[PDB]
């Protein structure tokens with residue numbers, strides 16, 4: 001019984017389990033806190049636990065370690081990785097900076113810790129517009145997601161240069177205008193909640209544009225929603241609001257990296273104290289500073 005074993009080991013290890021909204025239902029069901037990556041990392045800084053088991057992808061566990069350097073942070077599989085974050089290389093940032101010497105570098109939190117060390121400021125989907133509006137430059141380097149960059153450009157009026165030029169999340173890139181039309185045909189009383197990682201023409205059809213935390217916040221505004229994000233978010237929303245109706249926008253919006261994590265490797269993570277997440281000191285210090293500037297600018 002993996003659940004019973006996990007619960008006992010969590011107590012033995014003085015551990016907290018943090019799960020991203022895209023984790024499998026059986027993982028969400030054993031987590032202590034569920035949410036998006038930055039919010040989970042922040043909430044753990046106020047928790048008296050010795051060990052964090054991060055049920056999510058590598059950059060999320062890295063952010064938890066950056067903000068909780070004094071805790072052991074475990075990732076259940078090193079194959080839990082983010083294809084979008086991995087598209088942004090330090091080279092891309094430096095090459096972009098050498099080309100636009102006066103442009104600030106704004107890093108979406110969905111990005112490696114190493115990339116964060118070169119950012120002037122980080123952003124979440126929820127604070128990206130307010131942060132970028134406060135930058136003096138009308139030209140901004142933004143990464144790694146070109147679709148979020150386009151949304152920020154629209155809402156700020158600034159020129160936003162995506163780094164890398166084609167950075168994107170393959171899960172969110174799948175959604176199309178045909179998916180929007182089908183959603184309205186199959187669920188005519190639903191409103192559309194759309195992640196800003198979706199393509200701009202799909203963003204324009206949204207009733208609300210928000211990442212997963214904002215979807216949870218704004219779900220109270222209507223009783224039926226079609227959800228344009230990774231499909232496990234539907235499970236999360238149905239558990240939060242059993243009185244509402246939620247429908248996935250697609251049959252295939254599946255993040256392979258998120259689903260590298262299973263109940264069995266959460267058990268093995270606590271049993272064997274693996275896999276330990278470490279962040280080099282200089283990267284961690286610089287990544288912290290960009291995050292702190294984000295919170296001051298928002």
Ligand code: SF4
Nearest residue numbers: 082083084169171255
């Ligand atoms: S859903 Fe997209 S952005 Fe999130 S971890 Fe998976 S690949 Fe990365």
Ligand SMILES: [Cl-]
Nearest residue numbers: 020022082110
């Ligand atoms: Cl994600």
